[PDB]
Design a protein around this ligand. Structure first.
Ligand SMILES: CCCCCCCCCCCCCCCCCC(=O)OC[C@H](COP(=O)(O)OCCN)OC(=O)CCCCCCCCCCCCCCCCC
Ligand SMILES: CCCCCCCCCCCC(=O)OC[C@H](COP(=O)(O)OCC[N+](C)(C)C)OC(=O)CCCCCCCCCCC
Ligand SMILES: CCCCCCCCCCC[C@H](O)CC(=O)SCCNC(=O)CCNC(=O)[C@H](O)C(C)(C)COP(=O)(O)O
Ligand code: SF4
Ligand code: SF4
Lengths: 192, 126, 115, 129, 145, 93, 440, 88
């Protein structure tokens, strides 16, 4: 049976000893007047605070030396978008427009047609890196792993126009970063 | 008749919850305010109003349990609605509602009827 | 909680005549602060110009008819008063507020592109 | 207009839902809860709903002098104007909207079939005819 | 139980040689580490249909208005049987013995608001248990009991 | 002290009134505002605010709908004229 | 009025003023020069004093202040150094998130939630994931809900380090800020190993998580746990018992438990006032019922109490991390329904059924059955909740987000009234403001 | 219907006059969208071939439920419109 008879609940029941005890008065302090005055006047806690800070003065700092050293990276790192390529040389991408649909920021622009050989490829593939959010749905959406994000981050540019990646810029990165992307994929294959 | 009932104190011992001082003489003051609640029902709220029946279902139940128990701890535990100081608040603000509910005449028929389409979400009737 | 300077409760006025008097006092309130709006926002137009533009603002929409839509127009105009008097809008917005603004024949619109 | 309430005492939540029109006012819940003083200003700013009895209702989320209430369905997602800097005026000025790339609409290839049906009832039998 | 733990049980850079004994004499708390991770262990090897369907059986959306509300007190229930039909008139003329079982619970006692989780029961704890601040600090620690 | 008299208000009142579109250029105490000068709501407010800028006296909401003649405004300024408090430098030195 | 403004002793009737050389009226037209002939005493309460309403010193605690966690035009009206009225101007970061979600699918709307609070990411997206899961009527498997509990705690440590230490830094203690930020760098490594990006981990998706934990992550998570235990101790060395830290915070910003409920405060600024309520307990979710932990409740409702609660939240969170590492179950990490989760790439290219759902998931998205929901979770700031209306479409119809920092900033006027300008910084710091979350 | 609600919606003056909204039906519900602009609806950007636009109502579609409900809305906002009856 519950306390619904009294319009109460077991939830409304505060725990035993919930209420506060009586507050102390000046005659109910353990440390005598002289003991409290010495800590107060001689700055006992501040001097302890100083000493603990001085402990850290004799410890090795965490600082690393960029750009001579880099911080760690993971095979799942999401960085510069890049268009991959088959070993035989033919482009991996077959122009789903799965790319243009998933992209949350609408940073992917694809236009495609029949190639001369007839195999389905795309002649326009632009990424607005100023509009992208480096979400990662590029890499996840590809049924042929054609678009992947390299572990690169050092590509800051003077003019914003350089941040509009057309197909050739994406293909240049795909060749330039191919061996590195091999490290990333072959180290993340089991978990996908 | 000019009376004054202490709802919450402004000084004294804390009660865990901030800004909620310990009530000096809660137990009879709870009994007084609980009794004054039942007087307010008999003057304002009609008989068939289930709100009137719902007030007595716990006001009489609690107020009876308060009187038998003479320890402040036992009043909370069996009622099971928090501290004694909070139990004062629950009785007091419920008393005001009896004044306001009667003013609204919330025992009557639905005052404003909704239109046909108002409570239908995306075409399919709820 | 303490409400800010030049605040009014949002009330659904159920009288035609009371709304008439509320507006009339409001129009004077803008004119009383004519000197301030020039000095606060450093506007290029003198005090008489602001009153001229304020009058052009108040003369513009005096013929509304719906009381339920009268309160809404009085509510938001109160916010415009409160935002301006409390010096909340930036300097640029007031300068561009007064800096806004005859058509052309069909041949003129046909040639360049119309709309 | 929705009202989510919390009962720390009884450990439950409730949802008061009262309709409102573009012109029909809604009484303010400030006299009950002072915590809706900022939750109502957001609702007015993004919808234009007229709240009756608010101690001070005004813009809280949009720009000063903004025109229109954005969270409406007829309000375009891109807005009506965007700003830039005009060197001759020597100030940052509003201007009519211009998009170098328009918001492509991909809803056209949506579902043409039914997705979900009635489902399985779970109503306790004490609340049936 | 999170009691004090020595320095040599924490995966961190330590002290080798007499400097360990120098550290244990100067440092206020000898069982704290410098915080630098163990280069020899930490990150050493780098990372290189109907039977199973429920969405289609989602609970339905049913709304109960004054018309259907009145029907439960008069006709009864689909388990224990007993247009615009207004409730207010029904409450004005109906048997209170219907109320004390249908509209109310436990002899007319008001229904306490249903708990989002019944088993949220608290107990006050003590310093020797949770290892937190002593009593003078102005907080108290609660547990799930 | 209040150095304004009735004539001083009356003499300077006309010049402000001569600065706004008035049906007749003859304005005195007996002259009205809405009738003689043909001023509606918005027209009359500008003149009333203008006299606030020269006479430095604020008109309240109670008198707003209760103004009918120009003599009343002239007499009102005298009952509601004070010199602005001068800082410690101006007063005593 | 608007531009300027204008008794005990008996009103004494004195008439018939005379001098020794005539009457008052005989020399009335000459006595204005005679300053000793005036009849208006300056001490009289009814004496006409007309003074312009010169406005009080209104400093702008504006956007360009290091104390601000964003762009906040905090219009403070102060006389002397006390605080009379405060009117925060939020909106300087209104990106219009609620407007944009209505035009994007349920999967595409997830990355918006990591950008609400810059520090508590996986908790933010957990509340939208739970909201969609509640509507989808699908439940995450066990190992999925344990990953969300573990990274629920790590996120809380990440958020509280930003909240407590900046609050300590804004007071003036620069050192604890830098000691803790190395731990955030150490904790952000865990985010980057599972998801890929350091900060905005679009990891907790509706229907479990994104990808399984990398091998050996538990070993590295646990190893940090042993070392991290000392990091709080040194933090408590320079803050907890220091008298300067106590002075700056004790009795500063007193919030009553009854009044905290009135303004709808939640999180630390509701247990600071004494109410022992916690959402992780009131509504268990995502393997929080399995673990055990102690909540902290204050007694005075001031900044120092909320500091102690936040410090306790460090150790209690570290307590769960040990339990989550130990009690980790095996199995899947996301619901094995191809309609709400991508199929594995080993199977997408082998099974015709797998490829179809991969193609259909990313072009049209999954459809959420109609309804409405309001799921609230214990965010590090407080109660964060989303109101989501499902219109049977692959895009949500209404997405209102309850930001705990939004309501708290509203109660700034109630809290900061009567304190001094330095106490304004302490009050803001203990509110744990992140104006990305405030202006969602 | 008689209410000049356009003074409270904050919409620009061009929506009342120079724009036309179509009330169509794609198979159980009705929709409203605005007809395209004469010129400047879509011009090819000369930098990257982006589909630029000056029309701010191109991406807006309102999903209604019943025909008379849509017509009520269009009259309420003071919108010029025409109705396309679907073929049986
Ligand atoms: C640069 C130059 C150096 C400058 C600093 C010099 C350092 C030396 C300082 C010398 C003066 C300090 C005096 C300290 C001696 C007395 C202190 C003392 O006895 O405490 C005060 C005492 C309070 O009694 P209490 O200890 O509180 O007993 C109840 C305990 N619950 O009260 C009492 O009842 C006795 C008080 C005695 C009064 C005469 C002294
Ligand atoms: C005969 C003995 C001679 C001693 C001479 C020295 C006295 C010095 C002052 C003692 C009193 C005191 O520091 O007091 C603390 C005062 C006032 O505290 P309060 O307002 O009383 O609050 C306390 C209320 N209690 C009594 C309930 C606790 O504020 C402070 O925290 C000041 C902090 C000063 C920090 C300076 C750092 C410099 C470091 C130098 C080396 C690196
Ligand atoms: C520095 C920046 C400056 C920025 C400046 C900013 C100026 C803000 C403009 C305010 C516009 C506001 O929305 C609309 C309004 O003024 S509400 C008047 C609407 N009116 C009715 O709804 C019916 C009642 N109508 C009357 O009472 C008379 O028409 C009249 C008011 C003229 C009295 O005059 P009388 O009868 O001749
Ligand atoms: S990473 Fe994501 S946001 Fe960026 S271009 Fe690819 S799909 Fe778009
Ligand atoms: S998903 Fe892959 S193949 Fe398809 S369009 Fe994108 S890059 Fe090309």
């Amino acid at each position: 049976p519950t306390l619904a008879l009294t319009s109460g609940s077991i939830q409304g029941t505060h725990p035993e000893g919930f209420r506060l005890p009586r507050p102390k008065t000046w005659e109910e302090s353990s440390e005598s007047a002289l003991s409290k005055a010495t800590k107060w006047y001689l700055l006992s806690e501040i001097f302890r605070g100083l000493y603990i800070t001085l402990e850290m003065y004799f410890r090795a700092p965490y600082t690393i030396y960029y750009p001579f050293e880099k911080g760690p990276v993971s095979p799942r790192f999401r960085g510069e978008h890049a268009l991959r390529r088959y070993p035989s040389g033919e482009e991996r991408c077959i122009a789903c427009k799965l790319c243009e649909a998933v992209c949350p920021a609408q940073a992917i622009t694809i236009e495609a047609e029949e190639r001369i050989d007839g195999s389905r490829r795309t002649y326009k593939y632009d990424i607005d890196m100023t509009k992208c959010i480096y979400c990662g749905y590029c890499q996840e959406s590809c049924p042929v792993d054609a678009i992947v994000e390299t572990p690169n981050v050092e590509y800051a540019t003077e003019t914003r126009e350089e941040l509009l990646y057309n197909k050739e810029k994406l293909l240049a990165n795909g060749d330039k970063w191919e061996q590195e992307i091999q490290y990333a994929l072959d180290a993340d294959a089991p978990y996908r | 008749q000019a009376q004054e009932i202490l709802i919450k104190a402004n000084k004294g011992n804390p009660t865990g919850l901030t800004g909620l001082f310990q009530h000096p003489s809660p137990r009879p003051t709870l009994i007084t305010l609980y009794k004054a609640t039942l007087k307010n029902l008999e003057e304002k709220i009609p008989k068939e109003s289930v709100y009137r029946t719902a007030v007595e279902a716990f006001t009489k139940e609690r107020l009876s349990i308060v009187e038998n128990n003479e320890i402040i701890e036992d009043i909370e535990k069996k009622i099971g609605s928090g501290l004694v100081e909070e139990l004062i608040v629950q009785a007091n603000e419920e008393y005001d509602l009896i004044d306001k509910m009667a003013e609204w005449k919330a025992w009557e028929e639905l005052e404003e009827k909704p239109l046909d389409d108002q409570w239908t979400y995306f075409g399919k009737k709820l | 909680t303490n409400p800010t300077a030049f605040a009014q409760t949002t009330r659904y006025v159920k009288d035609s005549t009371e709304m008439r008097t509320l507006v009339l006092n409001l129009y004077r309130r803008y004119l009383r602060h004519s000197r301030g709006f020039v000095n606060n926002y450093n506007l290029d137009i003198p005090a008489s110009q602001v009153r001229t533009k304020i009058r052009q603002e108040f003369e513009r929409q005096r013929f509304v008819k719906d009381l339920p839509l009268k309160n809404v127009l009085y509510m938001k105009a109160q916010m415009e008063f409160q935002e301006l008097v409390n010096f909340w809008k930036q300097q640029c917005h007031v300068m561009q507020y007064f800096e806004s603004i005859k058509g052309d024949s069909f041949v003129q619109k046909f040639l360049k592109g119309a709309q | 207009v929705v009202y989510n309430l919390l009962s720390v005492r009884h450990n439950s939540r409730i949802r008061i839902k009262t309709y409102a029109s573009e012109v029909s006012p809604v009484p303010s819940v400030v006299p009950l809860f002072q915590g809706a003083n900022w939750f109502e200003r957001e609702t007015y700013d993004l919808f234009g709903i007229f709240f009756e009895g608010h101690p001070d209702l005004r813009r809280i989320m949009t720009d000063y002098g903004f025109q229109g209430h954005p969270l409406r369905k007829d309000f375009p997602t891109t807005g009506y104007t965007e700003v830039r800097y005009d060197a001759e005026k020597r100030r940052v000025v509003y201007e009519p909207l211009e998009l170098t790339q328009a918001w492509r609409n991909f809803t056209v290839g949506s579902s043409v079939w039914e997705q979900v049906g009635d489902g399985k009832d779970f109503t306790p039998e004490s609340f049936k005819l | 139980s999170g009691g004090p733990v020595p320095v040599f049980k924490k995966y961190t850079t330590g002290s080798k040689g007499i400097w360990e004994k120098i550290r244990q004499l100067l440092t206020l708390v000898p069982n704290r580490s410098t915080g630098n991770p163990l280069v020899k262990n930490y990150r050493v090897p780098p990372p290189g249909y109907y039977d199973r369907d429920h969405r289609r059986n989602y609970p339905r959306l049913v709304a109960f208005d004054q018309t259907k509300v009145s029907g439960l007190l008069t006709l009864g229930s689909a388990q224990n049987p007993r247009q615009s039909v207004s409730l207010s008139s029904t409450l004005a003329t109906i048997d209170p013995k219907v109320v004390k079982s249908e509209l109310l619970a436990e002899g007319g006692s008001p229904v306490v608001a249903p708990s989002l989780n019944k088993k949220m029961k608290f107990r006050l704890t003590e310093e020797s248990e949770h290892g937190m601040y002593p009593e003078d600090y102005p907080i108290r620690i609660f547990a799930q009991n | 002290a209040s150095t304004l008299t009735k004539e001083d208000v009356l003499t300077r009142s006309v010049s402000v009134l001569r600065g706004f579109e008035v049906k007749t250029k003859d304005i005195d105490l007996q002259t009205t505002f809405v009738q003689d000068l043909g001023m509606d709501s918005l027209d009359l407010n500008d003149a009333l605010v203008a006299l606030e800028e020269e006479f430095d006296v604020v008109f309240d909401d109670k008198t707003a709908n209760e103004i009918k003649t120009v003599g009343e405004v002239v007499d009102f300024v005298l009952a509601n004229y004070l010199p602005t408090e001068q800082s410690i430098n101006h007063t005593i030195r | 009025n608007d531009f300027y403004d204008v008794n005990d002793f008996f009103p004494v009737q004195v008439d018939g003023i005379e001098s020794s050389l005539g009457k008052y009226e005989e020399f009335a037209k000459d006595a204005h020069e005679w300053e000793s002939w005036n009849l208006q005493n300056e001490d009289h309460p009814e004496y006409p004093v007309k003074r312009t309403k010169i406005r009080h010193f209104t400093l702008n605690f504006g956007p360009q202040h290091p104390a601000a966690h964003g762009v906040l035009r905090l219009i403070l009206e102060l006389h002397g150094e006390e605080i009379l009225r405060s009117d925060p101007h939020v909106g300087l970061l209104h990106r219009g998130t609620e407007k944009l979600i209505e035009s994007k699918t349920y999967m595409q709307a997830l990355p918006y939630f990591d950008r609400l609070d810059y520090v508590s990411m996986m908790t933010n997206e957990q509340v939208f994931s739970l909201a969609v899961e509640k509507l989808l009527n699908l439940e995450v498997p066990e190992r999925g809900q344990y990953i969300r509990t573990l990274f629920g705690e790590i996120t809380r440590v990440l958020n509280h380090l930003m909240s407590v230490l900046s609050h300590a830094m804004d007071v003036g203690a620069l050192t604890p800020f830098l000691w803790g930020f190395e731990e955030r760098e150490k904790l952000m490594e865990f985010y980057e190993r599972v998801s890929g990006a350091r900060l905005h981990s679009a990891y907790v998706r509706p229907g479990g998580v994104s990808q399984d934990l990398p091998a050996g992550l538990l070993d590295d998570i646990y190893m940090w746990a042993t070392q991290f235990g000392d990091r709080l101790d040194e933090t408590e060395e320079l803050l907890t018992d220091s008298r300067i830290w106590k002075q700056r915070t004790i009795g500063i910003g007193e919030v009553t438990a009854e009044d905290a409920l009135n303004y709808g405060l939640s999180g630390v600024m509701l247990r600071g006032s004494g109410v022992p309520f916690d959402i992780r307990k009131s509504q268990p979710y995502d393997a929080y019922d399995k673990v055990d932990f102690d909540i902290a409740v204050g007694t005075k409702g001031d900044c120092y109490d909320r500091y102690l609660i936040r410090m306790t939240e460090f150790r209690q969170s570290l307590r769960i991390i040990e339990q989550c590492c130990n009690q980790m179950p095996p199995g899947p990490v996301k619901v094995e329904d191809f309609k709400v989760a991508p199929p594995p790439r080993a199977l997408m290219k082998e099974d015709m059924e797998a490829l179809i759902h991969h193609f259909l998931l990313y072009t049209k998205g999954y459809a959420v059955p109609a309804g409405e929901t309001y799921t609230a979770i214990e965010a590090p700031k407080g109660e964060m909740a989303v109101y989501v209306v499902s219109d049977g479409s692959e895009r949500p119809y209404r997405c209102k987000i309850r930001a705990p920092g939004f309501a708290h900033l509203g109660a700034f006027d109630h809290i900061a009234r009567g304190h001094f300008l330095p106490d304004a910084v302490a009050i803001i710091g203990t509110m744990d403001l992140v104006f990305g979350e405030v202006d969602r | 219907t008689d209410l000049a609600k356009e003074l409270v919606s904050g919409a620009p003056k061009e929506l009342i006059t120079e724009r036309v909204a179509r009330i169509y039906q794609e198979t159980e519900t009705w929709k409203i969208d605005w007809d395209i602009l004469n010129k400047g609806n879509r011009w090819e950007n000369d930098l990257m071939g982006y589909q630029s636009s000056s029309d701010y109502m191109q991406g807006t579609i309102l999903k209604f439920d019943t025909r008379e409900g849509a017509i009520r809305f269009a009259k309420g906002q003071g919108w010029d419109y025409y109705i396309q009856e679907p073929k049986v």
